[PDB]
A paper describes a structure:
In the Firmicute [name], the [name] gene product was shown to be a major nanoRNA turnover enzyme, and was renamed [name] A ([name]). We show here that Bacillus [name] is a bidirectional nuclease that can degrade RNA fragments from either the 3′ or the 5′ end. We have determined crystal structures of [name] [name] in its apo form, as well as complexed with substrates. These structures reveal a dynamic bi-lobed molecule with the DHH catalytic domain and the DHHA1 substrate binding domains connected through an extended linker.
Residue numbers in the entry: -4 to -1, 1 to 311
Amino acid sequence: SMASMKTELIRTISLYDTIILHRHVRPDPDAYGSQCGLTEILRETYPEKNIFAVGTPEPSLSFLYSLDEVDNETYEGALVIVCDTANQERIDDQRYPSGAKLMKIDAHPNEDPYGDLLWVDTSASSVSEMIYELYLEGKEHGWKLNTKAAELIYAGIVGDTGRFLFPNTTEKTLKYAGELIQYPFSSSELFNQLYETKLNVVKLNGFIFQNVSLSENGAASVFIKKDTLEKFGTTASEASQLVGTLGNISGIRAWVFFVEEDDQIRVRFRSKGPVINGLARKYNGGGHPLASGASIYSWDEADRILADLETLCKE
Ligand SMILES: Nc1ncnc2c1ncn2[C@@H]1O[C@H](COP(=O)(O)O)[C@@H](O)[C@H]1O
């Protein structure tokens, strides 16, 4: 059961003098909220321990918490905890298996079941929610949550659920958010910093909004070629990140972005209903029923994708 695993995690954390926490490369709010929220619980609870959070900062999330630089030596005999990383190959700072122990905490399917102690709960909204849950048990072992830690966990939850929009939001998620918002951090300032968007990514989004084609069957497309990328000064990853912004257009059922890179065209599939991971598979990609991707090599293939998207949507 989960109750037995949370208790073992807390017992194990108790034992180690030095604890170092990692999360995934290209961190998002949930990576910061889980890794740093837990770091901050442990610092507040165990002033005697040496606690570090490692990885390269994301400049847009750098306002939540600052990270540590640590020597290889520091790992000797350390407990290493990795948050919110489904695949060990995607862990930021690849020193994670070099301590005396390895603990994995994640909310994604346990396809890569690494670690000496594993707690993976796919029912959880986010790993930040999992950290709050662990704190609730830890409370009975003397754990203490301060204002910074509450703020971090709240940022993670709010980030990962699109502010209680997405289907990973549950009754627990909202309950815990109401407990967290009782701490005296400014929710409005947090939101303001999390949602701050570079002007040129804004302008690119406006190009995307003006240039979206919607068929009578609810199929939509946006082409983002090198010329457009260059005009707005936006990277291809910035463009791809905007794929979710079409979600509310009236009548939209499924859609694709085609984002040109140097050695491939990235394809990002999104849907309101009709399953699109087969379509991504058909073109050598894959992913979730409602969010998938592929990589193609000509504009001719893109037109084939479109055609297939019209068909799927029309059924
Ligand atoms: N080329 C690809 N091959 C396989 N899976 C992919 C590919 N691109 C995206 N995905 C998956 O599709 C889902 C949506 O991610 P993405 O659209 O890349 O942001 C995730 O589960 C990705 O791992």
